[PDB]
Amino acid sequence: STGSATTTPIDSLDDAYITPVQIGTPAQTLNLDFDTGSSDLWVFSSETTASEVDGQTIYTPSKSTTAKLLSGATWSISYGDGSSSSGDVYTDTVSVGGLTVTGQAVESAKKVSSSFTEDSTIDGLLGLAFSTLNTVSPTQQKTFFDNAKASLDSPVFTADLGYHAPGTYNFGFIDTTAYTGSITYTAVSTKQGFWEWTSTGYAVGSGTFKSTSIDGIADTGTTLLYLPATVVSAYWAQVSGAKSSSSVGGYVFPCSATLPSFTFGVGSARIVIPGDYIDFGPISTGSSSCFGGIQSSAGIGINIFGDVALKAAFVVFNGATTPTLGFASK
Numbered sequence: 001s002t003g004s005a006t007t008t009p010i011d012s013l014d015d016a017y018i019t020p021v022q023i024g025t026p027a028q029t030l031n032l033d034f035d036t037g038s039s040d041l042w043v044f045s046s047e048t049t050a051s052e053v054d055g056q057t058i059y060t061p062s063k064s065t066t067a068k069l070l071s072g073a074t075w076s077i078s079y080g081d082g083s084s085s086s087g088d089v090y091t092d093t094v095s096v097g098g099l100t101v102t103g104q105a106v107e108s109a110k111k112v113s114s115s116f117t118e119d120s121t122i123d124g125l126l127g128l129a130f131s132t133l134n135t136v137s138p139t140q141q142k143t144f145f146d147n148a149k150a151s152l153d154s155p156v157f158t159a160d161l162g163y164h165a166p167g168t169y170n171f172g173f174i175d176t177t178a179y180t181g182s183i184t185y186t187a188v189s190t191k192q193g194f195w196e197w198t199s200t201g202y203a204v205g206s207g208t209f210k211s212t213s214i215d216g217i218a219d220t221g222t223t224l225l226y227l228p229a230t231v232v233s234a235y236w237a238q239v240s241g242a243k244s245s246s247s248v249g250g251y252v253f254p255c256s257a258t259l260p261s262f263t264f265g266v267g268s269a270r271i272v273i274p275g276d277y278i279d280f281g282p283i284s285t286g287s288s289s290c291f292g293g294i295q296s297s298a299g300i301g302i303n304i305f306g307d308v309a310l311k312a313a314f315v316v317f318n319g320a321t322t323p324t325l326g327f328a329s330k
Contacts, residue, residue: 002172003099022095024064030123035221039133042107043124055120105141133193161311179314179328184269205260216303226297226304251292
């Protein structure tokens, strides 16, 4: 089997991407944030505290003939940005882009933190990291990808995120028309539950490539590119007027600037992030100070290849017995 679904930016900055997901019978379509940095599929629901729901589409298990309460199971998650959610669990039929899993754990939110409430466009998350990170207790549950894997033509999914445009998540096949040149594959460590790999270095604009190992995670659920302070300082030093602002919470730059590209290494191959991808616009409405899309990972504890990086590539998440990651230009 295979599946293919379009993923759409939630706003003009590509802050996140939503992908329609069918849950239950008859189908209830919710727009979920596919997150390769976590492993819970959770949704706004009829059980979510009413004051914490503001415009989202909810899953109502009582209206699904295939929903079954997973008795005794609860979940609770906190994300790298400080947001959180928790609730109980149903199993139900879940389909993405034509690919159907029966008995998928659908985690129903009883509580969500303010950042989720305030984002009306995201109805939940669909985790695509390794199932070892799943928070369901007392019986850990598998991700949608893990459940689908054996039925897939090939045990892979791919992320093809757009810059200010829709893109695609495919399951079970590699669309050879979706990228240019070749796909370069690189080793993955699953020891932390993430799609963790080591970039071979970087360049800033037309500058020379610096060969240096950068361990980090491929995370579709993080907006920006978070790299070591040395790398990030080298980037922003090429932008006149750029500075790290403690008050704003990262590097800012004059909105009048033209940003240089940023290149990262994948083995001997190179992925170029155009300068425009690194512009996240005014810090506040009407400001002439703009927020940078490359930020320091210092104090996160891990480097994160988020959407800013991933959207510059066609990315293969290879879930073979020994997982690997593939990157191609596009």
